[PDB]
Amino acid sequence: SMKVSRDSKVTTVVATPGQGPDRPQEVSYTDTKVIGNGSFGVVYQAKLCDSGELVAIKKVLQDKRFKNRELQIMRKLDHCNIVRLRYFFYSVYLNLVLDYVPETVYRVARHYSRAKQTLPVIYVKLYMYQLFRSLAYIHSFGICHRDIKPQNLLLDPDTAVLKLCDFGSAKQLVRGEPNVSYICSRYYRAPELIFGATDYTSSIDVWSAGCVLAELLLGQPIFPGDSGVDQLVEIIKVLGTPTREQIREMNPWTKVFRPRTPPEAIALCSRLLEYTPTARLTPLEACAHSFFDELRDPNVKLPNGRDTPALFNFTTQELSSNPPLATILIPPHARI
Ligand SMILES: COc1ccc(C2=NNC(=O)/C2=N/Nc2ccc(Cl)cc2)cc1OC
Incomplete structure (x- = not known):
């Protein structure tokens, strides 16, 4: 579940932090655009409403039968040379909110x-x-x-x-x-x-x-x-x-x-x-x-x-x- 408003089109989602304790966060973003496609699904570039910070959103089809392996792996990773999983949320589609790299x-x-x-x-x-x-x-x-x-x-x-x-x-x-x-x-x-x-x-x-x-x-x-x-x-x-x-x-x-x-x-x-x-x-x-x-x-x-x-x-x-x-x-x- 997500909510749409207009401040400019704004998307508000309740997302789970990529790492640490499960403490849901309200995340609001705007200015979404496709930056990549592939067999997996699509990659978007979005701007966080509050900070103006850019993020990437990788959206893939979610199989209800099993937990997403990419997600489970990424939740455990923390390295300066690996893209950071900030949050994740569902749309079913899994949305990975990652740091944006140009x-x-x-x-x-x-x-x-x-x-x-x-x-x-x-x-x-x-x-x-x-x-x-x-x-x-x-x-x-x-x-x-x-x-x-x-x-x-x-x-x-x-x-x-x-x-x-x-x-x-x-x-x-x-x-x-x-x-x-x-x-x-x-x-x-x-x-x-x-x-x-x-x-x-x-x-x-x-x-x-x-x-x-x-x-x-x-x-x-x-x-x-x-x-x-x-x-x-x-x-x-x-x-x-x-x-x-x-x-x-x-x-x-x-x-x-x-x-x-x-x-x-x-x-x-x-x-x-x-x-x-x-x-x-x-x-x-x-x-x-x-x-x-x-x-x-x-x-x-x-x-x-x-x-x-x-x-x-x-x-x-x-x-x-x-x-x-x-x-x-x-x-x-x-x-x-
Ligand atoms: C699954 O493939 C991915 C693609 C892009 C990113 C990505 N994360 N953070 C970013 O900034 C990303 N940027 N991707 C991207 C794609 C194309 C261009 Cl031309 C520039 C950036 C992450 C992915 O996997 C988790």
């Missing part, structure tokens, strides 16, 4: 691509590092996103802040439980998914992140193809034919990129984009990679003088996979 890596990468240019490496570092942090965080709960792609990576152009969104495919992966191989989008799918594996791990997200990194470096997807076969061919052309052992596990890099591509960017890709799922860097190990060393420099600034967003406020939860990595991850200047 851009996506997809649109940004496309602006550059169309202009035959490349995103400055400083932004590639900042975006990728933040993506790996969000993954280290979700994976620490055993949650695999399963659909990492530029359209699911939100970004604030001015603050250089990246936020992971779209938890509609996300799932807690439990050893011994099979999972569907038909998740994950064309050009971002790990080879084990292409091969039809149901015993895959969270490392599928690392492969997808490597595809995004390579795409930001190249200006186009690194493994295109409209079919699995075409995708595998593109993969084989770079990684070489997988060995019999590599197939069982799944169940020239320097020449790939433009001349002045930093060697550390290339090395990072080669460690993300590996056939053997267990051989891939974990997100936290990716964060600690030397390609991100510039971000740990005490004098680093955004091109426009502004400060970099928060990068070292790691929690114990976040570091749980490998606590000693805090040694690299938290630079001396961040330890006061």
Whole structure:
């Protein structure tokens, strides 16, 4: 139940806070507009009446038979690199009231691509590092996103802040439980998914992140193809034919990129984009990679003088996979 009034058309809903105790809130918003569509449902941009603050409203069809998995997952998440679930309410449709983020890596990468240019490496570092942090965080709960792609990576152009969104495919992966191989989008799918594996791990997200990194470096997807076969061919052309052992596990890099591509960017890709799922860097190990060393420099600034967003406020939860990595991850200047 919602109420409509005119101050300008105003919608007043009684919504449940995304986190904390269930204390219903009256939320009034106006100036709604569609910012995105998809198979899930629609995404709107709305303005909160009282604060003038912009929010995004993701509205999806609600199955009465079960609780929404995306909602349940998002209610438990609290990270600087994950879009925040402020409130949720019903219309049946589930409406997720999230923080509003102006851009996506997809649109940004496309602006550059169309202009035959490349995103400055400083932004590639900042975006990728933040993506790996969000993954280290979700994976620490055993949650695999399963659909990492530029359209699911939100970004604030001015603050250089990246936020992971779209938890509609996300799932807690439990050893011994099979999972569907038909998740994950064309050009971002790990080879084990292409091969039809149901015993895959969270490392599928690392492969997808490597595809995004390579795409930001190249200006186009690194493994295109409209079919699995075409995708595998593109993969084989770079990684070489997988060995019999590599197939069982799944169940020239320097020449790939433009001349002045930093060697550390290339090395990072080669460690993300590996056939053997267990051989891939974990997100936290990716964060600690030397390609991100510039971000740990005490004098680093955004091109426009502004400060970099928060990068070292790691929690114990976040570091749980490998606590000693805090040694690299938290630079001396961040330890006061
Ligand atoms: C489900 O897909 C989502 C899409 C957008 C957002 C989103 N949250 N907060 C925002 O600001 C969002 N913005 N989305 C968006 C979409 C398109 C453009 Cl071009 C810009 C922003 C969140 C989603 O999942 C929860």
